[PDB]
């Protein structure tokens, strides 16, 4: 009885102690959000205590098999999901302080208001469709003030006892410690070290610079015809006017961005209202897509046990669109579908969600899951990119034969597309790359304010409308940052999205421009695509990505060749104009 074998029957039972439990309180979960009631809300925290609780022994005794004498690769990667010792590692009086500040952060975010308004609805209209200069400004600097005076404090305590954890489990910082989500050992060909994550960020993001850097010029100008005093045509961009809070996204600058105004975008909701359509045909039309490349239909459990529509007034539901994988072969959707566009679009990002889930089903219990954080998502998302052609719109009956196409609604979507994903890029890296170097001890805190606008001058090109001193916390002012979540996750999935659709739609045959594909009836493409899925957790990411790219890493190429129309467009747009900008500017 070797030590590998006695963990193989460790194991064992806790698949199938875990499957039982998690069904249990999956179960509990969606009676409590598709039927609301203090029962219910009772019965799902006792099965999550329990399952917290089991999970919590269970990790107990996975510690009891060292990893250093387990030679089967995937037995050590069971045990090691199972013996991550986390906060655990900090004395009862350092954790119980690290929750209450945790707690404590995220209370004063969700609670904060400016004299009152909160961020949801209030202030977050007002930054998504104000363009008065004052209002916005007093948004930004009330909820900078307000809220991140308060977790200023907090984050500094927050920090430290966050790297003291990280260190006392053998990472260089907390950081490293996040990191540590993309690292990959004893697979030859196919390891990843944390340190390359960041190198390899920095490479991709040296690629998507100048794209990044000629939508600045764009969005400038069109920004200086909306707002003519205040912004400078060499200088950075006040942060209040991004169309967000933070401007994390550029979306809401769309009313003052858009190409060509008088060009409608495409919007089929009328078409799905006249041919009356229904929910049930909508999942049932995402389901044919999925179909088409090969993959199986939904299980006839999903359609009986789903819940695709608001039930009314009869009973309360959480109306957030979210994909169920219970275990045990169950397989849910839960949406509260309107007859619109973009709950079609949805609907097939969340199927492809439990593609995914199905795909990987037969893997061990520890190993359901995406290849590492950024796949799921971006499995979703390529089905939504499908789903929006108007090829593929013409082929579903949502679009007439003959609508003929326009570059420059084209143009207009592709801008779009543009503000949310090459703008957030920036903006994720260069926070991202704030927070390493706060945790890698780099940014005294007498500094911390000042090198995050630095920063947000340097890498992202924007201002802040009022100096800060260190008695704020705008990086707080953010829900992830305040509440205790990585962030270059959105990165890396962006690039991996992208990445999956160009080797999608290449096995699909397509060709002309990568944004006009479609790899509906494409075997070769879902077969490349479940390749991937099957494996879930059990092989290194940089496999999984290989298996449907050919290549082992992030790569951006694929991300500038959807774009590359809009740059070479936004190029003509600013041959006579300055593109970059000058970080030596302030309003
Ligand atoms: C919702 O929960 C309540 C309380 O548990 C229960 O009485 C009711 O039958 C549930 N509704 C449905 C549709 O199951
Ligand atoms: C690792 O162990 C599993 C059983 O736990 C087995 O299915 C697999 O073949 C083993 N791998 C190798 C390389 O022996
Ligand atoms: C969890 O803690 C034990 C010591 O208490 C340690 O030997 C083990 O390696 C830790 N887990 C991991 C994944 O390092
Ligand atoms: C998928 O389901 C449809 C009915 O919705 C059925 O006609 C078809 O044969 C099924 N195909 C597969 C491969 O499951
Ligand atoms: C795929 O084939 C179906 C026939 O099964 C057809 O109705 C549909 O228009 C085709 N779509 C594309 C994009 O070729
Ligand atoms: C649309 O694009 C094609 C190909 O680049 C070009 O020949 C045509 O002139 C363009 N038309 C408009 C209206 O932009
Ligand atoms: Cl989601
Ligand atoms: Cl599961
Ligand atoms: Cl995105
Ligand atoms: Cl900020
Ligand atoms: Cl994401
Ligand atoms: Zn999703």
Redesign the pocket.
């Known amino acids: 009885s070797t030590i590998e074998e006695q963990a193989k029957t460790f194991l064992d039972k806790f698949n199938h102690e875990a499957e039982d439990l998690f069904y249990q309180s999956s179960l509990a979960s969606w009676n409590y959000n598709t039927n609301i009631t203090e029962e219910n809300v009772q019965n799902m925290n006792n099965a999550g205590d329990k399952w917290s609780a089991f999970l919590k022994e269970q990790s107990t005794l996975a ?1 009891m098999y ?2 250093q004498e387990i030679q089967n690769l995937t037995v050590k990667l069971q045990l ?1 999901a199972l ?3 986390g906060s655990s ?1 900090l004395s009862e009086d350092k954790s119980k302080r690290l929750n209450t500040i945790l707690n404590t952060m995220s209370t004063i975010y969700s609670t904060g208001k400016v004299c009152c308004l909160l961020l949801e609805p209030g202030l977050n209209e007002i930054m998504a469709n104000s363009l008065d200069y004052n209002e916005r400004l007093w948004a930004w600097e009330s909820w900078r003030s307000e809220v991140g005076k308060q977790l200023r404090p907090l984050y500094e305590e927050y920090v430290v006892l966050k790297n003291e954890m990280a260190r006392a ?2 990472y260089e910082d907390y950081g490293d410690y996040w990191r540590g989500d993309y690292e990959v050992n004893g697979v030859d060909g196919y390891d990843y070290s944390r340190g390359q994550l960041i190198e390899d960020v920095e490479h991709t993001f040296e690629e998507i610079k100048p794209l990044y850097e000629h939508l600045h010029a764009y969005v400038r100008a069109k920004l200086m015809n909306a707002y003519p005093s205040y912004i400078s045509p060499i200088g950075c961009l006040p942060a209040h006017l991004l169309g967000d809070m933070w401007g994390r996204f550029w979306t809401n600058l769309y009313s003052l961005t858009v190409p060509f105004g008088q060009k409608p975008n495409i919007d089929v909701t009328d078409a799905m209202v006249d041919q009356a359509w229904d929910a049930q045909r909508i999942f049932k039309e995402a389901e044919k897509f999925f179909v088409s490349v090969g993959l199986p239909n939904m299980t006839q459990g999903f359609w009986e046990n789903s819940m695709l529509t608001d039930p009314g007034n009869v009973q309360k539901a959480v109306c957030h669109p979210t994909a169920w994988d219970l275990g045990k072969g169950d397989f849910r959707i839960l949406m509260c579908t309107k007859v619109t566009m973009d709950d079609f679009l949805t609907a097939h990002h969340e199927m492809g969600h439990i593609q995914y889930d199905m795909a990987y089903a037969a893997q061990p219990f520890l190993l359901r899951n995406g290849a590492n954080e950024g796949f799921h998502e971006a499995v979703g998302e390529i089905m939504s990119l499908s789903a929006a052609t108007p090829k593929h719109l013409k082929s579903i009956g949502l679009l007439s034969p003959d609508f003929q196409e326009d570059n420059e609604t084209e143009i207009n979507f592709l801008l779009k597309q543009a503000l949310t994903i090459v703008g957030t890029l920036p903006f994720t890296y260069m926070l991202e790359k704030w927070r390493w170097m706060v945790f890698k001890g780099e940014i005294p805190k007498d500094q911390w304010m000042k090198k995050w606008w630095e920063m947000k001058r340097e890498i992202v090109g924007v201002v802040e409308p009022v100096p800060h001193d260190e008695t704020y916390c705008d990086p707080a002012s953010l829900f992830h940052v305040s509440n205790d979540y990585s962030f270059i996750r959105y990165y890396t999935r962006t690039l991996y999205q992208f990445q999956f659709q160009e080797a999608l739609c290449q096995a699909a045959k397509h060709e002309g421009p990568l944004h006009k594909c479609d790899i509906s009836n494409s075997t070769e493409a879902g077969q490349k695509l479940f390749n991937m899925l099957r494996l879930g957790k059990s092989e290194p990411w940089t496999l999984a990505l290989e298996n449907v790219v050919g290549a082992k890493n992030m790569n951006v190429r694929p991300l500038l060749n959807y774009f590359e129309p809009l740059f070479t467009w936004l190029k003509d747009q600013n041959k006579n104009s300055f593109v970059g900008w000058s970080t030596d500017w302030s309003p």
Request: proline share 10%; hydrophobic share 20%; net charge neutral.
């Open positions: 510690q060292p990893l090691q013996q991550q010792n590692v489990n053998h």
